Amino acid sequence: MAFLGAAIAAGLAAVAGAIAVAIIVKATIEGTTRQPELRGTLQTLMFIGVALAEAVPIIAIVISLLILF
Amino acid sequence: MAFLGAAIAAGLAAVAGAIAVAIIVKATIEGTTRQPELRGTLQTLMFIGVALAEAVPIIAIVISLLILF
Amino acid sequence: MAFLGAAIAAGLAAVAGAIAVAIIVKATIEGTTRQPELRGTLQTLMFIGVALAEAVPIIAIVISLLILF
Amino acid sequence: MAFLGAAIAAGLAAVAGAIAVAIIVKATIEGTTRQPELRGTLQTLMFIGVALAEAVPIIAIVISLLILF
Amino acid sequence: MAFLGAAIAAGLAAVAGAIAVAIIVKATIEGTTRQPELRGTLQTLMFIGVALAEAVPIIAIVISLLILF
Amino acid sequence: MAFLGAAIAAGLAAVAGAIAVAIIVKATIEGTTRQPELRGTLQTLMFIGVALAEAVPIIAIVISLLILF
Amino acid sequence: MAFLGAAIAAGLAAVAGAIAVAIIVKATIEGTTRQPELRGTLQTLMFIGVALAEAVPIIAIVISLLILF
Amino acid sequence: MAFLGAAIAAGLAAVAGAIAVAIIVKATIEGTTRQPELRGTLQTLMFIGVALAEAVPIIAIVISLLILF
Amino acid sequence: MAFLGAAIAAGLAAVAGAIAVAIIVKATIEGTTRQPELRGTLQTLMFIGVALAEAVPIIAIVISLLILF
Amino acid sequence: MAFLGAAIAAGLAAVAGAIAVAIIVKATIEGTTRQPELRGTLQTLMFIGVALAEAVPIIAIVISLLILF
Amino acid sequence: MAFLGAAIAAGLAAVAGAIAVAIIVKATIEGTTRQPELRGTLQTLMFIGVALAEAVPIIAIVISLLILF
Amino acid sequence: MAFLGAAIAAGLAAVAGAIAVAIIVKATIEGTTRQPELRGTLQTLMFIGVALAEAVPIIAIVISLLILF
Amino acid sequence: MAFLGAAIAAGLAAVAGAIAVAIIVKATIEGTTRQPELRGTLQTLMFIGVALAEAVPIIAIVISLLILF
Ligand SMILES: CCCCCCCCCCCCO[C@@H]1O[C@H](CO)[C@@H](O[C@H]2O[C@H](CO)[C@@H](O)[C@H](O)[C@H]2O)[C@H](O)[C@H]1O
Ligand SMILES: CCCCCCCCCCCCOP(=O)([O-])OCC[N+](C)(C)C
Ligand SMILES: CCCCCCCCCCCCOP(=O)([O-])OCC[N+](C)(C)C
Ligand SMILES: CCCCCCCCCCCCOP(=O)([O-])OCC[N+](C)(C)C
Ligand SMILES: CCCCCCCCCCCCOP(=O)([O-])OCC[N+](C)(C)C
Ligand SMILES: CCCCCCCCCCCCOP(=O)([O-])OCC[N+](C)(C)C
Ligand SMILES: CCCCCCCCCCCCOP(=O)([O-])OCC[N+](C)(C)C
Ligand SMILES: CCCCCCCCCCCCOP(=O)([O-])OCC[N+](C)(C)C
Ligand SMILES: CCCCCCCCCCCCOP(=O)([O-])OCC[N+](C)(C)C
Ligand SMILES: CCCCCCCCCCCCOP(=O)([O-])OCC[N+](C)(C)C
Ligand SMILES: CCCCCCCCCCCCOP(=O)([O-])OCC[N+](C)(C)C
Ligand SMILES: CCCCCCCCCCCCOP(=O)([O-])OCC[N+](C)(C)C
Ligand SMILES: CCCCCCCCCCCCOP(=O)([O-])OCC[N+](C)(C)C
Ligand SMILES: CCCCCCCCCCCCOP(=O)([O-])OCC[N+](C)(C)C
């Protein structure tokens, strides 16, 4: 049952990565909305934000591949 | 369980991707409604944000194909 | 297992797409009500956003049909 | 197994579609309430909203019927 | 496995349909409370809303009956 | 498995009906508190709302009785 | 397998019935607090609301008894 | 199965009754805080609401205890 | 099986009673903070409320003992 | 089975007990923040509240030990 | 079962302990932010609160070890 | 089964530890934003809060290793 | 069981890590938006906060790999 091991690993990583970015991006959009001059700064905070937020889920994706292969 | 492993992966990736985009898009619509003059900036933040939020779910999808095969 | 792997894959994709569109459309309706003169740009944000929030759920349906067959 | 599969697909598609429409219609009723002049534009925005949101659930119903048959 | 199926499909259709109507009806009640003159207008949105929100749950029922009978 | 089915079907229809009525009645009570002169109007809207929300659960009940017998 | 069934049917009808009454009564208390003179009016709405809300859970309690005995 | 059943029917009836009373009592406490002169009215309304909210969970306890013995 | 039953019964009764009391106490504390002269009145409602909220969970505990022993 | 039962009974009692007083303490902290003169009164309600909220979860722990030992 | 039991007991104790502290600390941080003069008073309540919050989860951990050893 | 136990223990400890810190840190960031002069106290209050919130999750990780080894 | 073990340990660690970071990053973005001059201070809190929030999930990842290999 390595298939389920790759399913709920990549699946939970998908939910993790997507929602985390969605939260961060939304915060940037709302931030840019009321402070347009802070666009460049808030975009940088987003880019390093999603990078850290995707760290573990990517590792979970790697593990999901190691379970399959 | 190859079909189940391809169902959990693709299913959770669907929920991940769809909701994440919906969270991001809604933020832009609300932002554009507040600041129509930030239409171009917020839409750029959208496509960028959607691209990041779709990374892992798409990776979760190609895994669902590797499980099916 | 060939029917279960096509049920929770299509079921989750249904929940994914339907709710995602609902969130996006709701934002457009509320935006249009708040700012009627933005009816054009907000509706274009909808159709683009809905299309993006349907990418993976559509693939999840395609994968689901590949399970039954 | 086809009896259990067709149930989950149809069951979730029901949850998907019904809630999605409910969220959209809620926005239309609320929008029309605070802006009766925008009744027409919000109503057509509902129909195109329901149609897109009900798409995948309808497909999930077809798959459900394909599972059962 | 046919009794369980006919129950899940009908059980999830009940939850879907009842809540969907409740959300729509609540919006109609709130709107009528705010703008009593729009009672006939919002009541029409309710019936059109309920019917569309009841579509898939209704189909989920005939699928539940197809599994049972 | 017929006992388990009739249980879930009636149990989920119970959650469906009870909560749906609760949401509608709560809106009726709140609306009546806000605009008391609309007592009969909202109550009429409640009865129509309850009946429409009680539809599928009532159907899900006769399914439960059909599973038992 | 009838003990488990009669438990689920009665257990869910318990949660359904109790919470639904709580929501309706809470609205009655909040409304009575805001409008003390609408006590009897709202109390009548409560009794009618509770009766309709408890209708299906009571049926689920009967099915629970039928599953047992 | 009689043990496991009586657990669910009593455990869920516990969650049902306890939370429902909590919601009702909390509303009574908040209401009494706003309008101290409505102490007797709100308390009378509390007892009635609790009695109704506990009605079905009491039956669920009886049913569970009938499963045991 | 009597162990699993005693667990679910006592475990749910724990979650029921603890959260119920918490909600009631949280209300009494906020009520007392808001209106200090109603300290004795709200404390009585807390005790009466807790006794009613703990009624069923305690019975569920007794049942848990009846299943164990 | 006896181990699993001891887990559920103690695990749920942990979630019950911890969250219960967390709600109570948070209420006390907020109450003290607003009215620091009532710090003595509110702290009494906290301890009494915690004792009542931890009553059943502590019993659930006893059940867990009766199952284990 | 002993391993799966030691897991649930410790896992639920972790969820219980970590969240309950987070709730208390958040209240302390916000109270301190609101009233800097009460940083010492609220810190004591936090320490007392955490101790009461971790009590049962600690026992659940001890039990988890008793299941494991 | 030993791996499954080590999984649930480690997984739930991760969920517990991460989210708890997230709540505490978020409160500190919002506190620092509102009160820059209090960043010294709020950071200490964060570190103290984090250490307390990570107590049980760490032990749950230790147990996860004992189950595994 | 080693595949389900490594998956759950990695999957839940992903959900833990990603969401916890998302909450922390969002707080920093909103904080920077509210107070641009506190950018450097809040960026420090984010980096320290993320490192603490990712502590246990990373350990859970190590455990996940300590199940496979
Ligand atoms: C604190 C209050 C205590 C009240 C105690 C009330 C005692 C009188 C009520 C009847 C008790 C016995 O009720 C009975 O319980 C046991 C366990 O569930 C089961 O008993 C049944 O199975 C057991 C299995 O060994 C058989 O030995 C027994 O002949 C059979 O009747 C039945 O389910 C139920 O008929
Ligand atoms: C196996 C089943 C897996 C299901 C996974 C579903 C994950 C869905 C996560 C969605 C989280 C969205 O939270 P958010 O965008 O902050 O706002 C939510 C709205 N409020 C702020 C009002 C709460
Ligand atoms: C299994 C599937 C579960 C799906 C659950 C989906 C729940 C909803 C998802 C999140 C929807 C969006 O919320 P949000 O962006 O926080 O609100 C934004 C609104 N304001 C900006 C005004 C605050
Ligand atoms: C079987 C699984 C079924 C899951 C169903 C989940 C449905 C979730 C619906 C969630 C609707 C939320 O609406 P929204 O647009 O976020 O507005 C919220 C705006 N405020 C935050 C300001 C309130
Ligand atoms: C099977 C389980 C089904 C559960 C379904 C629960 C669905 C709950 C969805 C409704 C949650 C709230 O969102 P909403 O009222 O749309 O937003 C309100 C925002 N405005 C005020 C701006 C309109
Ligand atoms: C398994 C069974 C699960 C059933 C769960 C049912 C949950 C239903 C929750 C529905 C609650 C939301 O209601 P609504 O109409 O959107 O109003 C919300 C309007 N405001 C947000 C503006 C206040
Ligand atoms: C077995 C599972 C049972 C789950 C039951 C969950 C019930 C969820 C719905 C309960 C509340 C729905 O109230 P409503 O009328 O939408 O107004 C809500 C308006 N406010 C938000 C402002 C208060
Ligand atoms: C398995 C079942 C476990 C029990 C679940 C019971 C859930 C009951 C929830 C009932 C919630 C109270 O509803 P309401 O005051 O109409 O809205 C209040 C909504 N806000 C809190 C956001 C204001
Ligand atoms: C095993 C699962 C157990 C889950 C238990 C969940 C219990 C949730 C209880 C929620 C208590 C809510 O209180 P309420 O009366 O709606 O006040 C709301 C007051 N306002 C309307 C003004 C906001
Ligand atoms: C199996 C594990 C189940 C765990 C379930 C935990 C449920 C926790 C529910 C917590 C409900 C909190 O409600 P409350 O603070 O009275 O209302 C808040 C509204 N006011 C701010 C106006 C007071
Ligand atoms: C099996 C593991 C289950 C874990 C479940 C954990 C649930 C934690 C729930 C925490 C509830 C917090 O309540 P409270 O601080 O009174 O409300 C504060 C928030 N409102 C005022 C908006 C309502
Ligand atoms: C696997 C199980 C995972 C369960 C995870 C549950 C996480 C729940 C977190 C709930 C955190 C809520 O914080 P709180 O201090 O109550 O709100 C305080 C906010 N105000 C002060 C503004 C009211
Ligand atoms: C299966 C479990 C998946 C994980 C679910 C975890 C959900 C945690 C959500 C925590 C969100 C709450 O945040 P908080 O800090 O209370 O602030 C809220 C109060 N303010 C916004 C005013 C500051
Ligand atoms: C296995 C199941 C996985 C489910 C994962 C669900 C994760 C949900 C995380 C999102 C919850 C917290 O979001 P947030 O942005 O702090 O909003 C807090 C609410 N305000 C907008 C009002 C501040």
Side-chain angles (χ1 to χ4, degrees), chain J residues 2-31:
Chain J
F3 295 141
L4 174 60
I8 299 181
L12 264 47
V15 177
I19 302 301
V21 324
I23 300 174
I24 295 175
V25 169
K26 171 182 171 299
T28 307
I29 298 180
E30 288 179 337

Side-chain angles (χ1 to χ4, degrees), chain A residues 26 30, chain B residues 15 19 23 26 30, chain C residues 15 19 23:
Chain A
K26 173 197 172 189
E30 293 184 346
Chain B
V15 179
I19 295 300
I23 294 175
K26 176 184 180 181
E30 289 174 333
Chain C
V15 176
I19 297 302
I23 295 175

Side-chain angles (χ1 to χ4, degrees), chain F residues 51-65:
Chain F
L52 244 46
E54 214 72 278
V56 193
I58 256 55
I59 271 68
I61 286 300
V62 316
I63 302 306
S64 173
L65 295 180

